[PDB]
Design a protein around this ligand. Structure first.
Ligand SMILES: [Mg+2]
Lengths: 94, 126, 80, 105, 241, 97, 52
DNA sequence: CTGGAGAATCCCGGTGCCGAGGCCGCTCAATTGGTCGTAGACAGCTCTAGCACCGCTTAAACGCACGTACGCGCTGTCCCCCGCGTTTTAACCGCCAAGGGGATTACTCCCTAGTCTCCAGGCACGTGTCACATATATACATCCTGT
DNA sequence: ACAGGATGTATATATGTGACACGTGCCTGGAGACTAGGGAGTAATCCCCTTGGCGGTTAAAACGCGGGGGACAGCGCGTACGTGCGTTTAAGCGGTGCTAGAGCTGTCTACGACCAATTGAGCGGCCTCGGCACCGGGATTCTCCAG
């Protein structure tokens, strides 16, 4: 099937790591689904504009990292950058 | 307009609605079932005609008409109770060459249907 | 029609209670109704522009979410 | 054989997050590790928010994250309140706080 | 509602042995009247209205009722009623339905009552009951064919469950009842509006095609104009041109 | 009889409604107001039953947030009580003016 | 630790107690007679009069 | 400060409803494998700024001294919102039975748009300067503030 | 009910640090011929939701009505901020005078797109228990007069 895809399978996979026994209501799961579509578009739009700033025609991981630096308040940005860079580091070795 | 019509004729009455609160319903029924000097009780066929006792009156008038017989039968038998002391006449005002005739015809048809369907000796003897 | 009085004084007082207000002036209900009717008309006007453009006759919740994001006021929970 | 997402030690979808990138007219070239980075960041924010909301609800004697506690987790965090400053979580109400002036005694 | 205080009063008149609770009043009064009603035999017989059991049902469902009694059970015609569901989800060891007429208006009005009464006996649902009763419910105007062949078994099925005495021919100690119908006159202005309305283009169209409720609106506008006309339209002030 | 002093039931209303996340505007009247407002934009525009829900949530949040900024302007003038003067200052600073 | 079972006073009904409780309910019927009789509504007088 | 009533909260334990998750079964879409241009990266190299200094000039920042004007505080006065009980309007059913207005979806198809050329004006950066108006000068007009 | 005493304009003038004009060239529209894919124009399906409204009963508004305690006005006084004056600090407004590093150019892979398969998430679609939701105690907790 297809019709309407969403984040629900990843908001519940990531929730089962932080709190193995905690569930999530359909409304709250929908709210998380919506929230991720916010940050995705925000980071990707700032990254597209960043590519446009240094006149690149590609959004690389460097653009995404600089877009993450521009939005997260310090500690949030300092840990999100580490998450992204570790994921990219570990994905290039496989 | 019945409430207005009866004052034009000076008839002492009281009336019962879906809007009359419960304790007032009981008070009105008592101040008519057990009190004379009131001539007339104006009441709604559903809210007033469903299940309460009124032996203190007769001459039931059906000003309206409805194709569902249940309400009319139920309302008739508000007078025709155990504890009655006079024969109960039941008047029914039908406009001529007007659909009210057909409404009573439909009511009679459904009445006959019920007569057939459930009155066939569902007694304690069987 | 003029049904801006459906937002009644008790409702405005409940919205003030939720907002921490613990005493409300008398002329605060005829103010809040003018403040709320300007905010509604702005978000509805933008939701009807997103609905006319899609050649649709019903203002869907997506139109309201898009028009609310246009104002800056971002709400989470209706598919956007 | 192996989802691109799995090859990062993650739970989030590196594959679909690539398509959403190179379909939304952001640029003309999504790199090998642009979606691998964005997916990681998205999953990170989800981890943070979900943990906070989840045991805020479990602080409320609940075993099911409810949007009320989504709002509580977001509004109590100083970093997530800056991030989601202009976002209204529906059916999340507000935060309990009484101005000292109003309070009696 | 109207008979609530009658069941209380009659109780106190006939059986001054049981303790009675009569459940009516404003939102807070009904909370006050339930204080202590968890306790053993705090109340022996409880009276309440259909209409203020629907929005107070969380309190009643969580109780072991010995007998659940519905007066003028007529009020429970529909299975898709939402107070049929409210009363069905009541823990009751015995159920009793009182009504002057279990049905008059149509068949299938017995199935809701009997399924509420004996769920496991009448567990077979509307598909069975309609395929079973179709000749009888159609006999009036629609499907006839079987011509009251089914009536004997249908009637016999009810006999274990309902007692139906008729208070006219079985007890000759009762004043008589007369159906004194009286036909009523032309009523010139009533009839002017009647024959005008009944002949208008839109009413002709509606009577030709309509999604039920619009034609019921036609004949209910006729309730208006047949009963008295300021229901239909007040007589105009007449003034020189 | 017994009655609370002015300010006792007020803080109780504060506590009750600043803990329970639900709508506070009567549903049907607000849905009627939405149609009134939309009548002057495009005649005969249907509103999905969940579009008015989103509008109502986004309006109640806006009004609650505007009352939280009004109550600060009330306390700025040494006034525990809020009035049109405090809403106006709060909206002035918010850039809504 | 802060438990509240309220298993204390496990009161039960009995046949000897049945007739005693019926007796107090018969007295309650006798009291109901005071509800069955009636009194008046105590209507009120007209408003005070101006005199400038 | 304790009293003593009278209302509110506030967890404990109980009882069903129904959403949240459990699984199953195919559809979409992300992976795999491979050829084909190329994004940008990196290695020079031209050549603007940036930076860093130093002097002379003087506006300006700044400290001080002195009233005046404005700011927290008190209290009294009066009304207008809070609390709470009663009358009124809104608003659910049951009763009444389905059309139809309109999103949701495809299959054709013709029109619009990408792609990818080769020209040719027109937009940039010089250069060649012309000139608004900044700075300067003075009387005219308010525009004060102390008498 | 003034007048020193300041401060604020108003009008005029001039030349020099910025506003326009003119020529060039050369990257970029413009113009043109193919080739999809995209989107439009109908034609079918499935829903939901208005149909007109009515008369019972309820919760929520709405209204009466006391009264109390906060919103303001009045009064005062007691700092404290502007106002002005003398000093001095140090910025500005020009200069000289390196070389760090933009900005560019070129060159050439590693990188991105494509691209046909392939399959395995994933999403929909029912099912079935736990888990919140509401309830009904009784026991701690506040709030309100009362001494
Ligand atoms: Mg009865």
């Amino acid at each position: 099937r297809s019709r309407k895809e969403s984040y629900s399978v990843y908001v519940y996979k990531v929730l089962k790591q932080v709190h193995p026994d905690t569930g999530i209501s359909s409304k709250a799961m929908g709210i998380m689904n919506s929230f991720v579509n916010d940050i995705f578009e925000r980071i990707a739009g700032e990254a597209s504009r960043l590519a446009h700033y240094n006149k690149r025609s590609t959004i690389t991981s460097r653009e995404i990292q600089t877009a993450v630096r521009l939005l997260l308040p310090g500690e949030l940005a300092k840990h999100a950058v580490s998450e992204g860079t570790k994921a990219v580091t570990k994905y290039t070795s496989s | 307009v019945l409430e207005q019509f009866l004052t034009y004729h000076g008839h002492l009455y009281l009336r019962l609605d879906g809007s009359t609160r419960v304790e007032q319903r009981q008070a009105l029924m008592e101040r008519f079932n057990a009190d004379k000097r009131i001539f007339c009780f104006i009441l709604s066929t559903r809210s007033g005609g469903v299940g309460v006792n009124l032996t203190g009156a007769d001459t039931v008038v059906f000003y309206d008409s409805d194709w569902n017989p249940t309400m009319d039968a139920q309302a008739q038998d508000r007078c025709h109770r155990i504890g009655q002391t006079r024969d109960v006449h039941i008047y029914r005002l039908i406009s001529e060459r007007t659909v009210e005739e057909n409404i009573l015809k439909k009511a009679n048809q459904k009445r006959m249907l019920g007569d057939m369907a459930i009155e066939g000796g569902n007694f304690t003897t069987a | 029609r003029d049904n801006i009085q459906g937002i009644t004084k008790p409702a405005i007082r409940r919205l003030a209670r939720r907002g921490g207000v613990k005493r409300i002036s008398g002329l605060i209900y005829e103010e809040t109704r003018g403040v709320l009717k300007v905010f509604l008309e702005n978000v509805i006007r933008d939701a009807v522009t997103y609905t006319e453009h899609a050649k649709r006759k019903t203002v869907t919740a997506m139109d309201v979410v898009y028009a609310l994001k246009r104002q800056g006021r971002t709400l989470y929970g209706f598919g956007g | 054989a192996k989802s691109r997402s799995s090859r990062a030690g993650l739970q989030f979808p590196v594959g679909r997050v690539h398509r959403l990138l190179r379909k939304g007219n952001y640029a003309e070239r999504v790199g090998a590790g642009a979606p691998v980075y964005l997916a990681a960041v998205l999953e990170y924010l989800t981890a943070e928010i979900l943990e906070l909301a989840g045991n805020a609800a479990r602080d409320n004697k609940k075993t099911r994250i409810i949007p009320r506690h989504l709002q509580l987790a977001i509004r109590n965090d100083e970093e997530l309140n800056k991030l989601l400053g202009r976002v209204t979580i529906a059916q999340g109400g507000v935060l309990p706080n009484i101005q000292a002036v109003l309070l009696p005694k | 509602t109207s008979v609530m205080l009658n069941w209380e009063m009659e109780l106190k008149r006939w059986c001054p042995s049981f303790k009675i609770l009569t459940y009516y009043g404003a939102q807070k009064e009904r909370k006050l009247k339930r204080q202590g009603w968890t306790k053993p035999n705090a109340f022996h017989v409880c009276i309440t209205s259909y209409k203020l059991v629907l929005q107070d049902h969380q309190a009643f469902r969580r109780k072991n009722w010995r007998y659940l009694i519905l007066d003028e059970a007529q009020n429970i015609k529909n299975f898709k009623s939402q107070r049929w569901q409210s009363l069905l989800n009541f823990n009751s060891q015995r159920r009793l339905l009182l009504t002057g007429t279990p049905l008059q208006n149509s068949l299938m009005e017995l199935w809701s009552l009997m399924h509420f009464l004996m769920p496991h006996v009448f567990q077979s649902h509307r598909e069975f009951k309609e395929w079973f009763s179709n000749p009888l419910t159609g006999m009036i105007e629609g499907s006839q064919e079987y011509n009251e062949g089914l009536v004997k078994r249908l009637h016999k099925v009810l006999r274990p469950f309902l007692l139906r005495r008729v208070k006219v021919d079985v007890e000759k100690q009762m004043p008589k009842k007369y159906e004194h119908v009286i036909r009523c006159r032309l009523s010139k202005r009533q009839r002017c509006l009647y024959d005008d309305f009944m002949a208008q283009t839109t009413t002709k169209e509606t009577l030709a095609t309509g999604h039920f409720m619009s034609v019921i609106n036609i004949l209910m506008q006729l309730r208006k104009v047949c009963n008295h006309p300021n229901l239909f339209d007040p007589r105009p002030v007449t003034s020189p041109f | 009889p017994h009655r609370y002093r002015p300010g006792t039931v007020a803080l109780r209303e504060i506590r009750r409604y600043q803990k329970s996340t639900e709508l506070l505007i009567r549903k049907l009247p607000f849905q009627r107001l939405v149609r009134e407002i939309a009548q002057d934009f495009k005649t005969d525009l249907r509103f999905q039953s969940s579009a008015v829900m989103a509008l109502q949530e986004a309006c109640e949040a806006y009004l609650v947030g505007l009352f939280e900024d009004t109550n600060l302007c009330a306390i700025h003038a040494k006034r525990v009580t809020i009035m049109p003067k405090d809403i106006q200052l709060a909206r002035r600073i918010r850039g809504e003016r | 630790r802060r438990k509240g079972p309220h298993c204390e006073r496990p009161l039960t009904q009995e046949e000897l107690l049945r007739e005693a409780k019926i007796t107090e309910e018969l007295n309650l019927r006798s009291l109901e007679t005071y509800e069955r009789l009636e009194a008046d509504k105590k209507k009120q007088v007209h408003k005070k009069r101006k005199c400038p």
